[PDB]
Amino acid sequence: SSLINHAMSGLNAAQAALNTVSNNINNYNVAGYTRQTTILAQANSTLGAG
Amino acid sequence: GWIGNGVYVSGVQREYDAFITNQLRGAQNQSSGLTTRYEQMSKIDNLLAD
Numbered sequence A: 001s002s003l004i005n006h007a008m009s010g011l012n013a014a015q016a017a018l019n020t021v022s023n024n025i026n027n028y029n030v031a032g033y034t035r036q037t038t039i040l041a042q043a044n045s046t047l048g049a050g
Numbered sequence B: 001g002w003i004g005n006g007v008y009v010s011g012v013q014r015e016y017d018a019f020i021t022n023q024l025r026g027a028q029n030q031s032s033g034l035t036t037r038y039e040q041m042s043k044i045d046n047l048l049a050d
Helices: A003-027 B018-047
Strands: none
16 A cells, blocks of 8 residues: 555655746746756665565 | 745846946036037127128
8 A cells, every 4th residue: 555655755746846847937037046956766665575 | 855935026226326427417517617608609709700
């Protein structure tokens, strides 16, 4: 039943990434602004099953 | 983690300088006086025209 967490984690990270994108759209010509960015990572691997 | 809330407008600026303005003021006043003198002085000379 981990899939619920898998999907919802993906959704949360997607929202975060799009928030970063929107921040960039807002700033696109603000003086000195720097490209803002988000990063990802696989979750930690259990040996819970096969 | 690190985030942002987008963009906001902070101020309105004027392309103004006092010093250049005031030098120009002094020059304009004195020059106006000289040209005003020139205008009348000519009228006297034209009275001698022929």
